[PDB]
Short mmCIF file of C-alpha atoms in Angstrom, two decimals:
data_model
loop_
_atom_site.label_atom_id
_atom_site.label_comp_id
_atom_site.label_asym_id
_atom_site.label_seq_id
_atom_site.Cartn_x
_atom_site.Cartn_y
_atom_site.Cartn_z
CA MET S 1 0.00 0.00 0.00
CA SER S 2 1.69 3.17 -1.27
CA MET S 3 -1.22 5.59 -0.89
CA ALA S 4 -1.13 4.68 2.80
CA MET S 5 1.80 7.08 3.05
CA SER S 6 -0.89 9.76 3.40
CA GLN S 7 -1.29 8.58 7.00
CA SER S 8 1.88 10.55 7.75
CA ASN S 9 1.00 13.54 5.58
CA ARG S 10 -2.55 13.76 6.92
CA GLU S 11 -1.33 14.46 10.45
CA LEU S 12 1.45 16.48 8.84
CA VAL S 13 -1.03 18.86 7.31
CA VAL S 14 -3.35 18.78 10.35
CA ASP S 15 -0.39 19.32 12.67
CA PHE S 16 1.26 22.10 10.67
CA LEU S 17 -2.09 23.82 10.27
CA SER S 18 -2.60 23.83 14.04
CA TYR S 19 0.95 25.09 14.54
CA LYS S 20 -0.20 28.16 12.61
CA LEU S 21 -3.36 28.74 14.66
CA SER S 22 -1.09 28.81 17.71
CA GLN S 23 0.51 32.05 16.53
CA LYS S 24 -2.95 33.60 16.13
CA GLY S 25 -4.21 31.87 19.28
CA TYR S 26 -6.77 29.78 17.43
CA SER S 27 -8.20 26.60 18.95
CA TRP S 28 -7.22 24.12 16.23
CA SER S 29 -9.06 21.51 18.32
CA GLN S 30 -12.39 23.25 17.62
CA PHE S 31 -12.45 22.46 13.88
CA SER S 32 -11.27 18.87 13.47
CA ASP S 33 -10.24 16.86 16.56
CA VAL S 34 -6.56 17.40 17.33
CA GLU S 35 -6.44 15.11 20.37
CA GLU S 36 -2.78 15.58 21.28
CA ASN S 37 0.81 14.54 20.58
CA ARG S 38 1.54 10.94 19.58
CA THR S 39 -0.38 9.89 16.47
CA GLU S 40 0.22 6.25 15.54
CA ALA S 41 3.67 4.76 14.95
CA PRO S 42 4.60 1.13 14.22
CA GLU S 43 8.35 1.68 13.72
CA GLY S 44 9.62 4.66 15.68
CA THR S 45 8.57 8.25 15.00
CA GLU S 46 9.08 8.92 11.29
CA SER S 47 5.98 11.08 10.82
CA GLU S 48 6.95 12.93 14.00
CA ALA S 49 10.36 13.99 12.69
CA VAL S 50 8.70 14.62 9.33
CA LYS S 51 6.28 17.11 10.88
CA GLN S 52 8.95 19.15 12.65
CA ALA S 53 11.08 19.09 9.51
CA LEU S 54 8.38 20.92 7.57
CA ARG S 55 7.86 23.26 10.53
CA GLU S 56 11.49 24.42 10.52
CA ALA S 57 11.80 24.98 6.77
CA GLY S 58 8.33 26.49 6.81
CA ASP S 59 9.61 29.06 9.28
CA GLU S 60 12.44 29.98 6.92
CA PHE S 61 9.90 30.85 4.22
CA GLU S 62 7.60 32.92 6.42
CA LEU S 63 10.60 34.68 7.95
CA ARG S 64 11.82 35.42 4.42
CA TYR S 65 8.74 37.29 3.21
CA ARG S 66 5.79 37.29 5.62
CA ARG S 67 4.14 39.74 3.19
CA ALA S 68 2.78 36.86 1.12
CA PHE S 69 1.53 35.51 4.45
CA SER S 70 -0.93 38.38 4.91
CA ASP S 71 -4.67 38.91 4.42
CA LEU S 72 -5.59 36.60 1.54
CA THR S 73 -9.37 36.76 1.97
CA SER S 74 -9.31 40.49 1.23
CA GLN S 75 -7.69 39.86 -2.16
CA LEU S 76 -9.83 36.97 -3.41
CA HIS S 77 -13.28 35.63 -2.53
CA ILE S 78 -12.98 32.97 0.17
CA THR S 79 -16.33 31.28 0.80
CA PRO S 80 -17.62 27.71 1.39
CA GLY S 81 -17.72 26.23 -2.10
CA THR S 82 -15.60 28.83 -3.88
CA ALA S 83 -12.37 28.23 -1.96
CA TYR S 84 -11.85 25.32 -4.35
CA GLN S 85 -11.44 27.76 -7.24
CA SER S 86 -8.61 29.53 -5.43
CA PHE S 87 -6.76 26.41 -4.25
CA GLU S 88 -6.87 24.83 -7.71
CA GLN S 89 -5.40 28.06 -9.06
CA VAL S 90 -2.76 28.84 -6.41
CA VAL S 91 -1.74 25.17 -6.36
CA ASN S 92 -1.49 25.23 -10.15
CA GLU S 93 0.98 28.10 -10.57
CA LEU S 94 2.63 26.93 -7.33
CA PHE S 95 3.60 23.41 -8.44
CA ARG S 96 3.19 23.88 -12.21
CA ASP S 97 6.73 22.99 -13.29
CA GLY S 98 8.52 21.83 -10.16
CA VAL S 99 7.87 20.49 -6.67
CA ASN S 100 10.84 19.41 -4.53
CA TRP S 101 10.83 19.40 -0.74
CA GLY S 102 11.07 23.18 -1.00
CA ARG S 103 7.64 23.82 -2.51
CA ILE S 104 6.26 21.14 -0.20
CA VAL S 105 7.20 22.86 3.05
CA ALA S 106 5.94 26.20 1.73
CA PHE S 107 2.74 24.49 0.59
CA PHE S 108 1.94 23.38 4.14
CA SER S 109 2.49 26.84 5.61
CA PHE S 110 0.57 28.24 2.65
CA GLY S 111 -2.74 26.69 3.63
CA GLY S 112 -1.84 27.41 7.23
CA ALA S 113 -2.02 31.20 7.05
CA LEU S 114 -4.87 30.87 4.56
CA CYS S 115 -6.81 28.85 7.14
CA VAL S 116 -6.50 31.31 10.03
CA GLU S 117 -7.56 33.97 7.54
CA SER S 118 -10.80 32.17 6.70
CA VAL S 119 -11.75 31.11 10.24
CA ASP S 120 -11.20 34.75 11.21
CA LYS S 121 -14.03 35.72 8.84
CA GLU S 122 -16.44 33.26 10.47
CA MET S 123 -15.59 30.72 7.77
CA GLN S 124 -14.09 27.51 9.15
CA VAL S 125 -15.71 25.20 6.58
CA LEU S 126 -12.64 25.96 4.45
CA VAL S 127 -10.25 25.02 7.27
CA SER S 128 -10.63 21.23 7.37
CA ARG S 129 -11.55 21.25 3.68
CA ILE S 130 -8.16 22.82 2.97
CA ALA S 131 -6.23 20.51 5.29
CA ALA S 132 -7.49 17.47 3.39
CA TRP S 133 -6.75 19.14 0.05
CA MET S 134 -3.14 19.78 1.07
CA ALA S 135 -2.62 16.17 2.09
CA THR S 136 -4.55 14.43 -0.69
CA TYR S 137 -2.58 16.62 -3.10
CA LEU S 138 0.27 14.24 -2.36
CA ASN S 139 -1.67 10.98 -2.59
CA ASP S 140 -3.32 12.36 -5.74
CA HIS S 141 -0.71 14.65 -7.32
CA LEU S 142 2.53 14.87 -5.35
CA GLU S 143 2.99 11.10 -5.14
CA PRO S 144 5.08 9.45 -7.94
CA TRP S 145 7.70 12.12 -7.25
CA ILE S 146 7.61 11.71 -3.46
CA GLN S 147 8.77 8.11 -3.71
CA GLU S 148 11.06 8.65 -6.71
CA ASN S 149 12.82 11.37 -4.72
CA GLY S 150 13.31 8.86 -1.91
CA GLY S 151 10.05 8.73 0.01
CA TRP S 152 8.82 11.16 2.65
CA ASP S 153 11.63 9.72 4.77
CA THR S 154 14.23 11.04 2.34
CA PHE S 155 12.72 14.49 2.70
CA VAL S 156 13.37 14.36 6.44
CA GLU S 157 17.03 13.56 5.77
CA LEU S 158 17.52 16.12 2.99
CA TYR S 159 15.69 19.05 4.59
CA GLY S 160 16.25 17.79 8.14
CA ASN S 161 17.48 20.10 10.89
CA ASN S 162 20.90 19.79 9.26
CA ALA S 163 19.62 21.30 6.02
CA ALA S 164 17.37 24.09 7.31
CA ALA S 165 20.21 24.82 9.73
CA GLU S 166 22.92 25.57 7.17
CA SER S 167 20.56 27.72 5.11
CA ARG S 168 19.56 29.70 8.19
CA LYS S 169 23.24 30.02 9.08
CA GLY S 170 24.12 31.43 5.67
CA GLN S 171 20.90 33.36 5.04
CA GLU S 172 19.60 34.71 8.35
CA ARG S 173 22.83 36.76 8.44
CA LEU S 174 22.54 37.38 12.19
CA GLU S 175 25.24 40.06 12.23
CA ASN G 6 -12.52 36.79 -10.64
CA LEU G 7 -9.40 35.59 -8.82
CA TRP G 8 -6.41 37.92 -8.43
CA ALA G 9 -4.70 36.12 -5.55
CA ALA G 10 -4.52 32.29 -6.19
CA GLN G 11 -3.11 32.79 -9.69
CA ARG G 12 -0.61 35.52 -8.76
CA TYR G 13 -0.54 34.37 -5.13
CA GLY G 14 1.02 31.10 -6.24
CA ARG G 15 3.35 32.72 -8.76
CA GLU G 16 4.93 34.95 -6.12
CA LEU G 17 5.24 31.96 -3.78
CA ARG G 18 6.93 30.04 -6.60
CA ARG G 19 9.84 32.47 -6.93
CA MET G 20 10.63 32.34 -3.22
CA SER G 21 10.59 28.56 -3.65
CA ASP G 22 13.30 28.53 -6.32
CA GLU G 23 15.51 30.46 -3.90
CA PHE G 24 14.13 28.56 -0.89
CA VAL G 25 16.20 25.56 -2.00
CA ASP G 26 19.76 25.49 -3.35
CA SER G 27 22.06 23.94 -0.74
CA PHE G 28 19.88 21.13 0.61
CA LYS G 29 19.49 19.66 -2.87
CA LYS G 30 22.59 17.91 -4.19
#
């Protein structure tokens, strides 16, 4: 079962999403059912390390240009049933010709800020709906490449703390 | 009409290209 891999991405997307609500002080457990830490694991904690991995890199993106991570509902029409139009579009020009772990991490954070934006306008129906879209995107679209690249596990190794670290060390500047 | 999504993704794409460079290879 290859599609099963989603099991890790599902919580990935649900976890990351919640991580975003935290910044805005949003009860992520009032939309889906984010019980708590520890979500299945028959080997060790792959998905766990995978989640954090995306969190780190995702921080690098937001820190780079939070501008893009601003009010998105004010620009386009975000409503239950129309949100699909946007996603399909954004996702199109986003992963048109190229994916890589890079676009992946940014993709997770993408829906993150977009979620808090919707819920803020009394529109949570798009929240969960988006979370599933982000995950299924892999099982449906971002799949053959995920494995070919070396499986979600490979991602962890490539963009692991070691990766995001170097970049932050040679980009953040610090001074 | 949809100004964001379309452009929204485009802008995000650029940052992506730069987002990665050392990790890969």
